Amino acid sequence: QVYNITWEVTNGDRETVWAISGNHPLWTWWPVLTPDLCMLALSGPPHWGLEYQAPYSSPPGPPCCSGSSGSSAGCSRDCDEPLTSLTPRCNTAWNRLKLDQVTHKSSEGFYVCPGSHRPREAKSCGGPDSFYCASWGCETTGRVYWKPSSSWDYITVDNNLTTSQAVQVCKDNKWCNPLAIQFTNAGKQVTSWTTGHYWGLRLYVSGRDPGLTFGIRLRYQNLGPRVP
Ligand SMILES: *[C@@H]1O[C@H](CO)[C@@H](O)[C@H](O)[C@H]1NC(C)=O
Ligand SMILES: *[C@@H]1O[C@H](CO)[C@@H](O)[C@H](O)[C@H]1NC(C)=O
Ligand SMILES: [Zn+2]
Ligand SMILES: [Zn+2]
Ligand SMILES: [Zn+2]
């Protein structure tokens, strides 16, 4: 029986911030989810700079003079200036370029730790305040050089684009920090996806490691004769 399957990704307030739908039999469709890291941050931790923005809103910041469709009045030169001094966050096109730089540099990157579906790793991995990653060993994925993995956790997370592919997307003042979230074989075996599972993500930068939490949940609805 085919259903309209929607895979939703939520911010930490458990509100859908991104979704993908497709007509498939239940528990057969496991697409790479590509939410933007900054969408996870919508209405999230203050670091990212999107606290006041709602799910599904637009990237903040002025248009870059280097935008693909041309330069508009009020365009910022800054999308093209050195990223050296900037904080990796989501409030302008250049801060997001900086965020892309951090998520891609071999010495930095980001790592992800499981929420409530974790075992007795509660013991010190912490709550949402530590983005479930209070200590090393808590992370089960991410793009960082020690390549953390797990045989029980439900997802792998990486950057979806390389910086060369992301640079003009950020200069077009579009969301340009996409994650590529793949379902693992253990994840394809759980059926609790309708209640949804949560993770924390943290950048590996400056001895601070700014983070946020996000969720993944399943929704499905009938199609065809079963729709009344
Ligand atoms: C569900 O599937 C139908 C048919 O493919 C599509 O038109 C509709 O927009 C989808 N809605 C949602 C909320 O997924
Ligand atoms: C993710 O990467 C795939 C493969 O390069 C690409 O087709 C897709 O457009 C990308 N999505 C986002 C949101 O970056
Ligand atoms: Zn910060
Ligand atoms: Zn300026
Ligand atoms: Zn400047």
**Secondary structure of residue 192 in the 3-state scheme:** helix
Indicate if ligand 2 lies below 6 Å from the C-beta of 34: yes
Site to probe by mutation for ligand 1, drawn from 3, 16, 21, 217 as the one with most ligand atoms within 8 Å of Cβ, is: 21
Resolution of the structure, angstroms: 2.0
Query: So where are the chain's domains?
Result: 1-228
Residue where the block lists tokens 């931790």? 45
Say which experimental method was used.
X-ray
**Helix runs in the chain, H state only:** 37-40, 93-104, 122-125, 163-171, 185-188
Which residues are in the CB-under-5-Å shell of ion ligand 5?
A: 78
d(CA 152, CA 79): 41
The radius of gyration of the chain from alpha carbons, rounded to an integer in Å, stands at 18
- CATH number at 1-228: 3.90.310.10
Q: Are 143 and 178 in contact (CB under 8 A)?
A: no
